[PDB]
């Protein structure tokens, strides 16, 4: 029924992900189940399910998966069917199944593995080392729809104990690291997706998604284990060294900025750990890419990139804080990039953008990275002009205007100049006279509690009555 030998694999002598003596790899060309092992399978029905899984067509793959699930559901009848041999074969195919583009295939595969673990509890211990990292990768996924059922099922498998879940991270941290390393470095878009059946695009898109999930898993690993960084520093270094994580930070292209955001979270984690400070080259490379990302941000795609911008600013403030803005020193044109970014960012209003700008301004002012009068004051004023034009056409605007004012007032406080104060008063007056639904809206009025003295407000009210 099954013929041939994986002679090349025997020469290779690499078990890859698998620690059970069976090579497990994400790539299509290798890691396919060995023919002899498939022959060793307990039943003809099992052999057929495996052949269908091997076949490329999704509809056929799904039908086979459904059949496999049915066998698992009737565990008492099929306990004999399930065997260590089946488990070894399943592990090798499972890795390919998780990488599969189709959502249902992934969801079913995770469900199948969890069901198997519950039924075979205490008998899958040998295979747990192979299974758990893959299961965890599914649980932490960029896509919420696949991840949530998987996470709930995992908790149910472990009898709803959070501590057990945390323990799993600690027990498999080395294994998780190997998996993350393999995805980040060993895997390539070409390995993940066949060149003939897939375009240059999509293959790249797929690779980015897979690595992003691994990065998310990595962030989780750091959070779960404080000591993980120290024990596996060499592995962590290589993963960080690889440009692929950095390649993820591209804002020029890609459907979502979520992947870019995930990397930003990792960078903040590196800063909190001090791992990036400990290894200088990685930190420098990350900073350079972040500066490049600022260039990538453009007016044409600003609407898409606007939610992500406040997050970038907060990260910049932290990196900027480090070492008195050595981050700026790394790039000669970094200041120019920031100024260009500022103009692009201001044109599209975003929630939290002003707060980030003020925080960045505070970080810059210690080293005078941005001149208050030359660049920041005009920029803040331009932001007010933009806000006044958008009065409150897409409210939200009301909170944004208040957010700007609070930050602008603090920015104004650090001027000690009459002209700056006069400009602030004039801008406030211009916004107030033009008005909008702000008098009607309690929230807008309450949020901007004061931009002028109470007596001045009374004087303005008196002036309005006095005015013709």
């Amino acid at each position: 029924s099954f013929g041939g030998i994986n002679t090349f694999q025997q020469y290779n002598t690499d078990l890859g992900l698998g620690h059970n003596g069976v090579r497990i790899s994400l790539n299509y060309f290798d890691g396919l189940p060995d023919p002899s092992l498939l022959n060793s399978l307990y039943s003809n029905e099992l052999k057929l399910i495996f052949k269908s899984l091997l076949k490329r067509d999704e509809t056929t793959k799904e039908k086979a998966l459904m059949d496999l699930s049915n066998l698992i559901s009737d565990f008492n009848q099929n306990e004999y069917f399930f065997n260590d041999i089946f488990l070894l074969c399943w592990s090798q195919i499972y890795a390919k199944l998780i990488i599969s583009d189709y959502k249902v295939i992934r969801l079913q595969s995770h469900q199948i593995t969890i069901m198997l673990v519950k039924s075979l509890r205490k008998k899958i211990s040998k295979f747990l080392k192979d299974f758990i990292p893959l299961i965890l990768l599914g649980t932490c996924e960029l896509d919420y729809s696949v991840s949530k059922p998987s996470l709930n099922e995992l908790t149910e498998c472990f009898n709803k104990d959070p501590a057990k879940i945390n323990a799993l991270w600690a027990v498999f941290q080395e294994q998780l690291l190997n998996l993350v390393k393999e995805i980040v470095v060993n895997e390539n878009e070409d390995t993940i997706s066949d060149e003939r059946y897939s375009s240059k695009e999509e293959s790249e898109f797929r690779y980015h998604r897979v690595i992003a999930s691994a990065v998310l898993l990595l962030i989780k690993l750091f959070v779960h284990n404080k000591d993980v960084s120290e024990r596996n520093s060499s592995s962590l270094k290589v993963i960080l060294s690889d440009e692929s994580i950095w390649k993820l930070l591209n804002l020029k292209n890609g459907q979502n900025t979520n992947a870019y955001e995930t990397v930003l979270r990792l960078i903040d984690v590196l800063y909190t750990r001090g791992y990036m400070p400990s290894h200088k080259n990685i930190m420098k490379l990350a900073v350079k890419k972040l500066l490049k990302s600022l260039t990538h941000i453009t007016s044409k795609n600003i609407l898409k990139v606007c939610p992500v911008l406040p997050s970038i600013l907060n990260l910049l403030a932290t990196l900027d804080d480090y070492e008195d803005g050595t981050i700026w020193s790394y790039d000669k044109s970094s200041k120019e990039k920031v100024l260009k970014f500022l103009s692009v960012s201001r044109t599209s209003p975003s929630p939290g953008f002003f707060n980030a700008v003020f925080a960045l301004y505070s970080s810059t002012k210690r080293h005078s990275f941005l001149d208050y009068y030359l660049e920041w004051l005009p920029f803040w004023q331009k932001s007010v002009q933009r806000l006044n034009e958008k009065g409150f056409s897409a409210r939200n605007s009301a909170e944004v205007l208040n957010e700007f004012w609070t930050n602008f007032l603090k920015f104004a406080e650090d001027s000690s100049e009459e002209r700056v104060k006069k400009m602030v008063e004039s801008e406030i007056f211009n916004s107030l006279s033009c008005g909008k639904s702000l008098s009607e809206y309690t929230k807008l009025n309450q949020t901007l509690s004061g931009v002028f003295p109470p007596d001045k407000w009374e004087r303005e009210i008196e002036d309005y009555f006095t005015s013709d």
Binding site: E58, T59, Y102, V104, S145, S199, E201, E202, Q255, N256
Partner: protein, 225 residues
């Protein structure tokens, strides 16, 4: 997911199915794979009704649907209307429309908030749409295509429009609908995108010949991730 499905070989799923947030409608003469796609992806939370509209297997082009209401043509029989009333939840309202154009899926492109209609519909039908669906209505054509339901796919998150559409028409329709719109193709280049696929907040179902860049455009514009 944009789920690859065929209706017995047909790569046009919007013709034979109508998908909203609250319910789904499928034709009675359907294959096991075609039913299994909606049963697996939708789950048990959302009812799937096997229905016939006016004696026809085509139901997506005959009916226009919303989470608040469903519109059916005059030719729909009392048995089909009673079966839809029993199978559907109590929240949705089903009302017959007495209007000459009579193919409501072709005539009306609608979502939860805002709707695009054929320009030449009757005023009583426009008020009936605004009453039953609770949806504000605009009479507009997509670059001269009067069949806005066939030539647009619309959801709450975003919209896919006809590929040969003027850019000025794209920002005009985008500002009018308050959602981002992308010109694109479905089912290996077929122009009829609304007939090509169905979409809601978390699911899109398309034909098997829909290629990978087209599917990527679908999931990008409808934010299904």
């Amino acid at each position: 997911m944009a789920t690859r499905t065929q209706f017995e070989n047909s790569n046009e799923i919007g013709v034979f199915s109508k998908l909203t947030n609250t319910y789904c409608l499928v034709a009675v003469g359907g294959s096991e794979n075609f039913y299994s796609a909606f049963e697996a992806e939708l789950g048990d939370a959302i009812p799937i009704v096997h229905t016939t509209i006016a004696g026809t297997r085509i139901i997506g082009r005959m009916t226009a649907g919303n989470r608040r209401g469903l519109l059916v043509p005059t030719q729909t029989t009392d048995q089909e209307l009673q079966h839809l009333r029993n199978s559907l939840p109590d929240s949705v309202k089903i009302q017959r429309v007495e209007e000459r154009l009579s193919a409501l899926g072709n005539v009306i492109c609608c979502n939860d908030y805002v709707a695009l209609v054929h320009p030449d519909i009757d005023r009583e039908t426009e008020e009936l749409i605004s009453d039953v669906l609770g949806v504000e209505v605009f009479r507009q054509t997509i670059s001269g295509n009067i069949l806005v339901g066939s030539y647009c796919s619309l959801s709450n998150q975003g919209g896919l429009v006809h590929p040969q559409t003027s850019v000025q028409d794209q920002e005009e329709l985008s500002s009018l609908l308050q959602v981002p719109l992308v010109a694109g193709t479905v089912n290996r280049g077929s122009s009829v995108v609304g007939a090509g696929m169905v979409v809601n907040d978390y699911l899109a179902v398309t034909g098997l010949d829909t290629t990978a860049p087209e599917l990527s455009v679908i999931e990008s514009i409808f934010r299904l991730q």
